[PDB]
Amino acid sequence: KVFGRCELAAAMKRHGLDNYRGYSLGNWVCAAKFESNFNTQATNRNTDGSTDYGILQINSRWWCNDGRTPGSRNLCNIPCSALLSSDITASVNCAKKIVSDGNGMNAWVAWRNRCKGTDVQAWIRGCRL
Incomplete structure (x- = not known):
């Protein structure tokens, strides 16, 4: 599913x-924009052989199982495919664990490079919330 911004x-x-772990909603919307362009089916392979999945590009090296990431963990206890669903429950639940891991949203390099320090509230401007 390709979500709308306000959707x-x-x-x-x-x-x-x-405001989960202190991160306002705009931070999450901004991260999703630059990770996936709001597409739940986004996948991207990393040079290390892991893959990033879903709207928040959650990595198979630590968080999900895809059966082809040697030496990796599955700390969210999910198949990586669950992160591609039109239902964002699994991606959200797993993101809550990631952002709790110690480095906040810096776990998402795209957030650090493209959202952090910016006017993230613009990403929710105009939305019925």
């Missing part, structure tokens, strides 16, 4: 991401 903002809020 995804609403869904992230309903699933409890707004």
Whole structure:
């Protein structure tokens, strides 16, 4: 599913991401924009052989199982395919674990390079929330 901007903002809020670990909703929307362009089916292979999955490009090296990432963990206890669903529950639940891991949203290099320090509130401007 390719979400609209405000559509995804609403869904992230309903699933409890707004101000989760102190990160306002715009941070999450901005991260999703630059990770996946709001496409739940986005996948990208990493040079290390891991793959990133879904709207928040959650990596198979630590968080999900895809059966082809040697030496990796599955700390979210999910198949990576679950992160590609039109239902964002698995991606949200797993992101809550990631952002709790110690480095906050810096776990998402795209967030650090493209969202951090910016006017992230613009990403929710105009949305019915």
